[PDB]
Each structure stands twice: as structure tokens, then as C-alpha cells.
Amino acid sequence: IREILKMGDPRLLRIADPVDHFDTPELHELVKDMFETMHDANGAGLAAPQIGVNLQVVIFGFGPPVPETVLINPTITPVSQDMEEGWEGCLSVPGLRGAVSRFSMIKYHGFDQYGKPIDRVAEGFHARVVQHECDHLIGKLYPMRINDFAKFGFTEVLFPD
Amino acid sequence: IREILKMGDPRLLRIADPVDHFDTPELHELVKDMFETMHDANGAGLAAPQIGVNLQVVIFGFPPVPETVLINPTITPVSQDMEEGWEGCLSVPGLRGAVSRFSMIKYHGFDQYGKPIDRVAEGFHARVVQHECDHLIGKLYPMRINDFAKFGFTEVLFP
Ligand SMILES: CCCCC[C@H](CC(=O)NO)C(=O)N[C@H](C(=O)N1CCC[C@H]1CO)C(C)C
Ligand SMILES: CCCCC[C@H](CC(=O)NO)C(=O)N[C@H](C(=O)N1CCC[C@H]1CO)C(C)C
Ligand SMILES: [Fe+2]
Ligand SMILES: [Fe+2]
Numbered sequence: 100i101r102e103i104l105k106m107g108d109p110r111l112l113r114i115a116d117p118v119d120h121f122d123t124p125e126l127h128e129l130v131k132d133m134f135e136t137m138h139d140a141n142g143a144g145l146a147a148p149q150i151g152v153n154l155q156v157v158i159f160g161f162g163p164p165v166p167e168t169v170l171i172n173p174t175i176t177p178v179s180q181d182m183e184e185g186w187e188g189c190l191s192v193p194g195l196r197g198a199v200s201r202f203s204m205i206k207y208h209g210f211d212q213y214g215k216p217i218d219r220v221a222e223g224f225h226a227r228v229v230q231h232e233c234d235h236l237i238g239k240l241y242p243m244r245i246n247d248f249a250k251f252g253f254t255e256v257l258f259p260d
Numbered sequence: 261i262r263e264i265l266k267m268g269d270p271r272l273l274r275i276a277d278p279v280d281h282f283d284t285p286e287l288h289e290l291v292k293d294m295f296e297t298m299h300d301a302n303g304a305g306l307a308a309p310q311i312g313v314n315l316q317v318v319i320f321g322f323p324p325v326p327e328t329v330l331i332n333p334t335i336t337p338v339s340q341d342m343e344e345g346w347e348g349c350l351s352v353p354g355l356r357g358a359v360s361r362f363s364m365i366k367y368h369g370f371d372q373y374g375k376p377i378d379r380v381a382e383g384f385h386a387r388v389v390q391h392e393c394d395h396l397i398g399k400l401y402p403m404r405i406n407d408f409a410k411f412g413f414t415e416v417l418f419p
């Protein structure tokens with residue numbers, strides 16, 4: 100379990116490099132380390148830059164249910180311009196929550212750690228999670244996406260139950 | 261010591277009302293409570309909405325900044341010059357962000373006895389005054405940040 104970087108660390112602001120070689124022991128190790136870190140923190144997702152690794156690798160999936168997924172070198176294409184506001188938190192921004200507008204429906208493409216292609220359509224929370232994780236790959240944390248800072252604050256204050 | 265409200269509380273997001281009557285026991289008690297709370301938290305300033313009181317009262321003092329009670333304030337920039345600087349807030353513990361503020365301002369207001377206050381301030385003095393008065397119009401400093409690359413946890417930004 101690697102330490103999760105916190106907002107303020109310049110490494111969270113970088114644009115991640117694509118993975119060049121699949122099905123390698125080092126990539127398998129990266130994925131294993133990420134799942135260990137994510138599960139330990141009870142996260143719904145994790146991006147490699149969050150543990151200081153500048154590669155386009157994200158994982159996500161939790162039992163609404165989101166499929167357990169390793170997504171590498173991703174691209175996201177919105178199906179429509181419809182957007183929806185939802186509450187987000189981030190392991191790199193502990194103690195806070197913010198309302199973030201995301202696309203309601205997306206197609207996304209990428210590869211697993213064996214280099215097998217992934218092509219999916221997602222909506223709602225699933226789509227939100229993928230957008231949130233992929234944002235980390237271009238050096239974005241959700242406060243960069245917040246438009247209404249009345250809807251940003253400490254979890255304990257926003258949700259006292 | 262009154263609790264300092266934390267970001268997310270709707271009371272931090274409102275327009276404060278002016279004080280109508282000066283030199284009252286309730287105003288003296290407010291000022292005392294604010295100073296006790298501020299000092300307990302090691303702050304350089306405090307605004308009444310931060311303890312849930314929606315009135316145009318701020319205090320500050322820490323080129324030392326003079327200890328001041330400023331009521332019903334107005335701020336007028338002397339020039340349009342601005343400078344970016346790191347800010348934190350007792351209502352936003354653990355974080356810092358870069359905020360642009362006017363470099364030079366005049367400000368006007370009253371003390372708790374109703375005596376006028378009229379000053380010119382620059383640099384940090386001007387920054388604290390702008391920061392405190394922003395609370396009176398429902399503004400927390402993350403609302404003034406345009407570039408969140410310059411925002412993060414204090415311990416990480418400044419180890
Ligand atoms: C929701 C969009 C973000 C999902 C991914 C994050 C994990 C993370 O840091 N991603 O890089 C997460 O688990 N966030 C959780 C989160 O935001 N949740 C959990 C489900 C509901 C929502 C809070 O409203 C908690 C742990 C902060
Ligand atoms: C700086 C502009 C804001 C000044 C007032 C705040 C206090 C506050 O919340 N006022 O409403 C303060 O003391 N902030 C301090 C602060 O921001 N400082 C201390 C001096 C330098 C700067 C940190 O960069 C600490 C306590 C967070
Ligand atoms: Fe995150
Ligand atoms: Fe403040």
C-alpha cells in the first residue's frame with residue numbers, strides 16, 4: 100500500500116504518459132499496488148498519478164454497482180452534451196466534498212493490463228467515476244471542475260449524519 | 261469561545277447586515293467573543309459570520325497590523341494594482357490558496373463605540389482587511405481562486 104498524494108503535490112498536476120507495453124510484470128505490479136491502496140482506503144477508484152506514477156492507468160469498481168475495471172490509455176467521448184451535478188470526494192482531497200457537473204452519458208475506450216481493448220458506454224455514477232479518474236490523468240482534481248463554490252466544503256459540515 | 265463555522269456551513273455564504281446601534285452591551289459582548297475565539301485559534305482576523313452572527317463586524321491585528329475593530333466597513337481601491345499571495349482561513353482549516361488582492365486600499369468604518377475609522381493600507385494589511393470584509397458578503401477565499409493549481413493542503417505546499 101503506497102501513500103496517496105494530497106492536493107498541493109505537483110505530481111497530481113501532470114499529464115500522464117501512455118503505457119507502451121502491456122502484459123509486463125511491472126504493469127501487473129502497478130495494478131496490484133493500486134488495488135491494494137484503493138481497497139485499503141475504501142475508494143471507488145484510483146489513478147496512478149495519485150501514488151506518484153505518471154502513467155495513464157486507472158482502476159475503479161465497487162459493489163450503484165460499478166464494474167471492477169483496469170483502464171489504460173483511456174479516451175472519453177460524451178454521448179450527449181447533457182450534464183448532471185453530483186457530489187464528489189477524492190482520496191487526494193481528504194475531508195472535503197464538492198458538487199461537480201459531469202456528462203450524464205459517455206463512451207469510453209482503453210485497454211486492460213493484458214492489452215485487450217475496452218469499449219463501453221456508461222451513464223450516471225459509472226460515467227462519473229470514469230470521468231473523475233481520467234481527470235487525474237490530465238492533472239485535474241475535482242476542485243478544478245467546481246463552478247459553484249457554495250457547494251464545496253467539509254464532509255462533516257455538508258453531511259452531519 | 262464560540263465555535264468557528266467551517267466551509268460548507270450556509271451561514272458563511274450570506275450578506276451581513278449593518279450594525280444599527282453602537283456602544284451597546286450586546287455589541288461589546290460580540291467583540292469580546294470574537295477576540296476570544298480568534299485568539300484561541302491563533303488567527304490574524306475574524307469576521308462575525310464565522311461565529312454565526314450575520315453582522316458587519318470584523319476584527320484584525322497581528323509593519324505590524326494594528327489591533328482593530330471595524331464595523332460597517334467600506335473598501336475603496338487606491339489603484340487597480342493587484343498582487344497574488346497565499347491565504348488561509350480559520351473556516352477552511354488545513355488548506356492554502358493563492359489569491360489576488362488589491363495592493364493598496366483605503367477603508368472606512370467605525371469602532372464599537374461608533375467612532376469613525378479611516379485608513380490607507382497596503383500589502384498584508386490590505387490583504388487581511390479585504391479577506392475579512394469578503395466574509396461579510398458571503399465570500400470565502402476559494403471563491404476568489406481562479407487557478408486551483410495554486411490550492412492545496414498546507415503541510416504539502418509548505419513542508
Ligand atoms: C464520486 C466520484 C469519485 C469516485 C472516486 C473517489 C476515489 C478517488 O480518489 N479517485 O481518484 C472516491 O472513492 N470517492 C468517494 C466518493 O466521492 N463517493 C463515494 C460514493 C459517493 C461519493 C460521495 O458522494 C469517497 C471515498 C470520497
Ligand atoms: C492571510 C489572509 C487571511 C488573514 C485572516 C485569517 C483568519 C480568518 O479566517 N479571518 O477571517 C488568518 O489568520 N489566516 C492565517 C493566514 O492565512 N496566514 C498567516 C500569515 C500568512 C498566511 C498564510 O499564508 C492563518 C491562520 C491561516
Ligand atoms: Fe480522486
Ligand atoms: Fe477567513
Ligand SMILES: [Mg+2]
Pocket residue numbers: 278280
Ligand atoms: Mg438597519
